Amino acid sequence: HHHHHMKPYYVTTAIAYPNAAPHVGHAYEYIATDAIARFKRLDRYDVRFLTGTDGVPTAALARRNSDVFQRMQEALNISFDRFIRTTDADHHEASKELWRRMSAAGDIYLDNYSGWYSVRDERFFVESETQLVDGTRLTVETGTPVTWTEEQTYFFRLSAYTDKLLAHYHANPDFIAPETRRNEVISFVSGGLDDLSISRTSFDWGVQVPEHPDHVMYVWVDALTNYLTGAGFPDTDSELFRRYWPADLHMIGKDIIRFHAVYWPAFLMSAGIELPRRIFAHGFLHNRGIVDPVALAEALGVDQVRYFLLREVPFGQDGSYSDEAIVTRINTDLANELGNLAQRSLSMVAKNLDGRVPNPGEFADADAALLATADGLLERVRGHFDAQAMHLALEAIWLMLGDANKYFSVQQPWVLRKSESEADQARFRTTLYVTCEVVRIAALLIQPVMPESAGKILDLLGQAPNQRSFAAVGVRLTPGTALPPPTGVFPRYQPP
Amino acid sequence: HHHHHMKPYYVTTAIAYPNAAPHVGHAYEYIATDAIARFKRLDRYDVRFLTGTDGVPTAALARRNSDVFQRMQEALNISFDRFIRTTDADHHEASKELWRRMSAAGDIYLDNYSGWYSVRDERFFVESETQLVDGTRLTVETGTPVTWTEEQTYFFRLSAYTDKLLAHYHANPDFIAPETRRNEVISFVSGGLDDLSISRTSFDWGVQVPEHPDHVMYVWVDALTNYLTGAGFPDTDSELFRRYWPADLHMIGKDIIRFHAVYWPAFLMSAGIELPRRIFAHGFLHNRIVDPVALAEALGVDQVRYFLLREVPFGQDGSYSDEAIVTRINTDLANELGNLAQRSLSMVAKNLDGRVPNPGEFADADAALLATADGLLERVRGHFDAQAMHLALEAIWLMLGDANKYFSVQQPWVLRKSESEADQARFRTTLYVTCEVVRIAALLIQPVMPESAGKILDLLGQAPNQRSFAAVGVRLTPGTALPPPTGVFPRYQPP
């Protein structure tokens, strides 16, 4: 009964709230988290990569959510793992069990409350958190209407966890990232926290509170438990839960950080459940002077868009999109620096070395320096990925590709091809081998960012599909390997 | 510059040879040696507990070794000490220095030789040590193929140390254990020894012989020096070597006893290096191969550690069966130890406000049980010093038998019902005595079942700083607050 060997890694994308519809607006988040998951799969991890998502209006919306999810997954090549339907997941047993544990811990109480309530956010707001935009009172943070409501509601004793949360932040400095987001959460919690309304009296459809069917949970309370549902909760003895909980990484947008970094860990502390290891809040994309990567991918190519978004924007910051910025990356970074270097060297293998990887001679100093830089990339890229700094990992790879192109232009293997010498031909073989070998290493490491284009390059280098994990980075290109006739992988931008 | 104050104790598990894979098949060995090391740490020793281990086919095989090691260490809770890698260790300087010393002493010579050679064992074999099994010539001892080779090789003058080895066995009766293994080694050496080939001419990867780069040492010659490397050798003036060499105990399987009890001490005699103090060769397990890692994941790490160290007299071969381990899980652990702790701790919680009672004056029955418990540490220490962990565990559970008998005779559940003044006093005394002997037993079983014993000590309100053997002589403090009792030893759950 051994169906797994590698260390597990459980990573989630964000719940939909405050949007009723999942997936929409999450393409950037999905591309980034997919690259993280693909990197972990290539680095000998058992990856579990899941979404944070689970009358007549509600059901057709379920078809649209499905259609949007399939299109986004296929257009951007997201490799979410397949979740198995269970009876507990259909009946919201996770949030009901979480409620039971928090109630049994003494952290849930009924009370009367009056204040500004937002139907869309399902939250209460204080006076300073509202504003009259134009004779209509809206929330300052989200812009949703509020009306004054006097309700009976169940509260979570969030105030009893202010210091416990600050102690968790101090003991786990990598729990919240990037650092500007960590400083903001610490500043917020340090000001003190009030108790948190978590239910409403309603007969509308929703997750009924255990023992109190006249109350229903707010949508975001039950939504957060989807992370636990993804690991088989409330079946804490199940193999799924022992293996994958706690989650290693919650990937979210910075708009819902307080739900994940304050409310969520307090809920889990109250219920006696292990907390997630890390929360990373990314920024949002805007046009220069909203950005739809699915439409960009269909127009420009999936790997061009995935590369641009993960390279142009330092992950965590807000990003600016201009057509000029992505055209340069498509034409310079991809088509020229990587594509043309691979095409030039592979063309000489096919035409002058009978389509066979040459056996290199003894490596000169210039050969060893370039190989040493490439051999050191896996360690540097792994460190950047562990901090969710994919832009720095891609910059490191293209810095090596810069050295490789410089090396290629200095060695001039296309002029050594002519000479009938014994030393020029040996130098011809060695320089082509070194260029192919560093292209192989770069192609292996860009698989998380551009899976198909990297796969095509590895096909051109005669690498079987079984020899494409990061363990293969330390195994040099085999002389005598037969290479297929080279074809283009990274085309130049074609204006409409 | 005092980073130590206790007497050092250096104990090793065996080198991998003949198998190229370390750790594989050594789980039973690791568990027993870990219990010995844990006992020494609790007994005010500075313990150094190390393994005897250090192209493309060899690199990823090193990844598998690390995976097997970390999984085995975690599944069985083995507490090997952390080895610091140095420049000398990376370049195999210990075996080079050992070879130099033996050569400088005149004990290594080059010679021609012809005979049956096993590339797997890296040893030569005489005709009577080979056999044709089905048209192929194998060693009778290990079943590896041999081919007739006529090679130049370096020899160690083992014949010059036959009598010196016998004199060492006689002067040090505890050097080899158990006694059946000692008798076999003495009989072998008494028959006389030939000189020992220790190198081969090959351009494969290996430890090149100093001053003769065409020869490489046999893998087991270099492997033996890992024991020296663990103590900082060849840096004989290092703090590690002065403090931890000679090794106090080489724990090995009896399959490689001649490498450790004959070749190894003769090497060290030639090199002028102090000999290890003691070598213990344990037996092998079989079903009526046994995989303790798989057993632990299915049954519980402490259930498996206990069964393996109690069921088989250490040094003998053992037979593990499902019924035999179920008996020890349910009787020895869940009932004899578990329910004795649960029934008495539950009475402290419900009847004595979760507070250790202040006992009255001890009756003859109370003092008799306490006396048996107070004498356990000395008896268990003597068994561990002979590596007789089965006898240490038997001595502890014989006391737990007396405690269960004492508990049933006193009937504390009857005394709690009486509003009398005398009965309530006797009720406090018998509960204190029962908790006190459970505390002593839990302290002494820490080397065998670290986690379960820690849980019992948690239920008895013992802080983590008061769990060494120096705390055995400090009675349970009346007034100590106890957490609500929870289960520690579950009964066997059939799948």
From TrEMBL, chain A:
Keywords on record: Aminoacyl-tRNA synthetase, ATP-binding, Cytoplasm, Ligase, Metal-binding, Nucleotide-binding, Protein biosynthesis
Catalysed transformations (reactions): tRNA(Met) + L-methionine + ATP = L-methionyl-tRNA(Met) + AMP + diphosphate
GO MF entries: ATP binding; metal ion binding; methionine-tRNA ligase activity
Gene3D superfamilies: 2.170.220.10, HUPs (3.40.50.620), Isoleucyl-tRNA Synthetase, Domain 1 (1.10.730.10)
Every Methionyl/Leucyl tRNA synthetase domain range: 9-129, 141-345
Positions of short motif 'HIGH' region: 16-26
Protein location: Cytoplasm
Residues that bind Mg(2+) 1: Y28, V313
InterPro entries: aa-tRNA-synth_I_CS, Anticodon_Met, Met-tRNA_synth, Met-tRNA_synth_2, Methionyl/Leucyl_tRNA_Synth, MetRS_core, Rossmann-like_a/b/a_fold, tRNAsynth_Ia_anticodon-bd
Any one biological process term the GO annotation gives: methionyl-tRNA aminoacylation
Domain of life of the source: Bacteria
Keyword Ion transport set for record: no
Coiled coil: none
Stretches for region Disordered: 483-496
Key word GTP-binding present: no
GO cellular component, one term: cytoplasm
Subunit structure: Monomer.
Sequence similarity: Belongs to the class-I aminoacyl-tRNA synthetase family. MetG type 2B subfamily.
Protein name: Methionine--tRNA ligase
Organism expressing this protein natively: Mycobacterium tuberculosis (strain ATCC 25177 / H37Ra)
Lineage of source species: Bacteria, Bacillati, Actinomycetota, Actinomycetes, Mycobacteriales
This protein's encoding gene: metG
